[PDB]
Amino acid sequence: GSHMKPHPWFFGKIPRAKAEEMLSKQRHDGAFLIRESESAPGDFSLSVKFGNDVQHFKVLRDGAGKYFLWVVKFNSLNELVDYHRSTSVSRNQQIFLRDIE
């Protein structure tokens, strides 16, 4: 059956510096991870590799508690992540999220 495994993209609390340090070593654009921001408690950040840069997206929450980056809302970080596997996380370029390797 569909193997029940933890998600390899949740790195918990790690500095923005170590995530950039780790993701710059990734082979493919879209390589990403969700981290718990240390700039403010309970906030999450999405770090994605693109070219020789690592882009950081802040995960926002609305009045009902849903998550979002731009306009579409998600009931979980899990659905937000999967959504951006097939729809770009970026406004300026097409960047699709893909698992680290």
Binding site: S45, Q55, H56, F57, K58, L60, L69, W70, S90, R91
Partner: peptide, 7 residues
């Protein structure tokens, strides 16, 4: 900073 506007 972050790529997407935060407010």
């Amino acid at each position: 900073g972050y790529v997407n506007p935060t407010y």
